[PDB]
Amino acid sequence: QRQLVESGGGLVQPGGSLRLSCAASGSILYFNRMGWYRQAPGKQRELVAAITSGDSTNYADPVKGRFTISRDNAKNTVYLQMNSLKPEDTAVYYCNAKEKGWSFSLYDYWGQGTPVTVVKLVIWINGDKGYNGLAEVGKKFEKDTGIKVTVEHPDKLEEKFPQVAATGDGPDIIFWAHDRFGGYAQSGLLAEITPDKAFQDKLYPFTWDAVRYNGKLIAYPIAVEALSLIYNKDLLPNPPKTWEEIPALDKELKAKGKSALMFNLQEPYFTWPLIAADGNAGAKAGLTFLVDLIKNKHMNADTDYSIAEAAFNKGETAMTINGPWAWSNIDTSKVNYGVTVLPTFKGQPSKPFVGVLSAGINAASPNKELAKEFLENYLLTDEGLEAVNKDKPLGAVALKSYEEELAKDPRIAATMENAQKGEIMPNIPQMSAFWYAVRTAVINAASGRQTVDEALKDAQT
Numbered sequence: 001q002r003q004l005v006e007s008g009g010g011l012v013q014p015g016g017s018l019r020l021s022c023a024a025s026g027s028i029l030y031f032n033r034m035g036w037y038r039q040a041p042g043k044q045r046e047l048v049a050a051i052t053s054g055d056s057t058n059y060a061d062p063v064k065g066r067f068t069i070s071r072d073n074a075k076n077t078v079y080l081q082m083n084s085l086k087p088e089d090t091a092v093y094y095c096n097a098k099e100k101g102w103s104f105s106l107y108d109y110w111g112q113g114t115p116v117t118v119v120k121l122v123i124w125i126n127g128d129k130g131y132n133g134l135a136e137v138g139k140k141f142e143k144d145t146g147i148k149v150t151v152e153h154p155d156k157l158e159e160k161f162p163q164v165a166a167t168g169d170g171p172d173i174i175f176w177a178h179d180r181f182g183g184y185a186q187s188g189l190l191a192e193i194t195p196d197k198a199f200q201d202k203l204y205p206f207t208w209d210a211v212r213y214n215g216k217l218i219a220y221p222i223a224v225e226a227l228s229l230i231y232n233k234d235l236l237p238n239p240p241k242t243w244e245e246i247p248a249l250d251k252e253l254k255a256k257g258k259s260a261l262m263f264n265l266q267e268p269y270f271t272w273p274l275i276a277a278d279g280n281a282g283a284k285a286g287l288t289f290l291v292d293l294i295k296n297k298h299m300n301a302d303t304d305y306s307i308a309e310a311a312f313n314k315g316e317t318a319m320t321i322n323g324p325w326a327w328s329n330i331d332t333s334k335v336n337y338g339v340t341v342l343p344t345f346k347g348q349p350s351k352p353f354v355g356v357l358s359a360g361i362n363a364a365s366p367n368k369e370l371a372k373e374f375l376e377n378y379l380l381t382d383e384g385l386e387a388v389n390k391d392k393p394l395g396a397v398a399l400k401s402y403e404e405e406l407a408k409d410p411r412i413a414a415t416m417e418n419a420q421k422g423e424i425m426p427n428i429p430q431m432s433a434f435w436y437a438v439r440t441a442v443i444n445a446a447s448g449r450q451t452v453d454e455a456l457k458d459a460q461t
């Protein structure tokens with residue numbers, strides 16, 4: 001009898017290629033039509049290509065321009081050269097042949113089927129982090145498996161993820177501080193994390209608590225993040241221990257064509273430590289001081305991450321407020337820098353919010369088990385976290401094995417100092433609305449629109 005046998009089905013990276021081949025146990029000359037049909041999980045049969053005895057070739061609009069149906073009557077084989085592959089292609093590919101009998105009737109013949117998988121691992125992490133290093137981990141993953149690991153860093157990913165991941169595909173794995181994850185968990189945008197005891201035991205038990213919402217693990221903890229006072233040792237050997245002595249220092253420095261302190265005033269995460277130093281009466285005190293700095297022309301009105309960073313690295317400002325991630329760019333520059341305790345306000349310390357960098361798996365992802373493999377066996381390893389850390393520092397890693405190395409770093413000590421003086425952010429769904437309320441409040445008071453008393457009024461509502 002006549003039997004069709006398909007081959008060439010495997011795993012590939014989008015943009016890659018695959019040659020399917022279907023050999024018959026009889027001459028193709030006898031066939032009228034030969035063609036390729038595909039079936040994806042839970043869907044109807046979809047013709048992709050066909051070739052008639054008359055040498056005419058037809059294709060479906062999705063594959064048109066990308067796929068070519070070929071035939072070799074010597075080898076008694078029909079081919080499907082699939083170029084520039086996409087995730088929509090992923091399906092079981094079947095070979096079909098039609099034969100007119102001697103009489104009026106015809107015969108349809110089918111094959112076993114050949115599986116084609118187009119898989120890409122996509123990761124969303126912020127641009128201020130070590131995406132290049134995260135890619136080096138992803139490159140080792142592809143060597144040991146065959147899956148592509150692209151690393152993306154889009155603007156406003158914290159508020160682009162819940163919109164795109166809900167409707168569209170978005171990323172497989174999302175990287176952000178633990179505070180944003182409760183809102184994703186409530187909305188149903190994250191898969192429940194199920195790590196075995198042995199993996200679980202590799203990380204500090206306090207770190208796991210930050211990535212827990214209603215008794216379910218919603219992410220993998222990576223590292224603890226806290227803002228510190230970054231200062232130029234040459235321009236300022238004995239930096240301010242108090243916030244209230246910065247105006248004096250600024251007067252001194254402005255005479256020599258230099259600023260005292262430049263940091264991101266737009267993002268409320270950077271201004272919150274000063275606001276929360278005393279506490280309400282504490283928020284009113286802390287903000288009024290911040291307002292007086294802009295009013296006394298000590299700080300610029302629209303001071304953002306880029307002009308603050310650049311100014312410090314250039315050697316224009318004596319101080320800056322930033323996280324572990326910012327250190328590598330300073331090292332690149334020729335600035336003898338120091339990382340230390342944040343200045344105190346009204347005697348009491350400035351309480352910076354503490355973030356736990358965490359990796360979560362998107363609920364609407366087909367690569368949930370592949371991402372778990374990447375996160376556990378490749379990223380959350382000594383070797384894996386090292387790679388990320390040499391690009392842009394992670395801070396105080398969640399890995400137990402890294403304690404000695406963390407403790408040997410003076411900047412980590414300063415980070416941990418500030419983290420103890422601060423507090424970990426609750427993961428709750430209301431954090432988004434809270435942060436927005438503070439973001440507006442600080443900008444309005446900074447520019448000169450709303451009063452300090454009226455800012456806390458609108459923010460408490």
Ligand SMILES: OC[C@H]1O[C@H](O[C@H]2[C@H](O)[C@@H](O)[C@@H](O)O[C@@H]2CO)[C@H](O)[C@@H](O)[C@@H]1O
Nearest residue numbers: 126128177179180267268269270355435
């Ligand atoms: O600015 C408010 C913003 O702050 C925090 O985001 C930090 C993030 O945690 C850090 O890793 C760093 O990259 O900067 C961000 C602020 O610029 C909160 O995690 C976030 O929810 C909040 O929107």
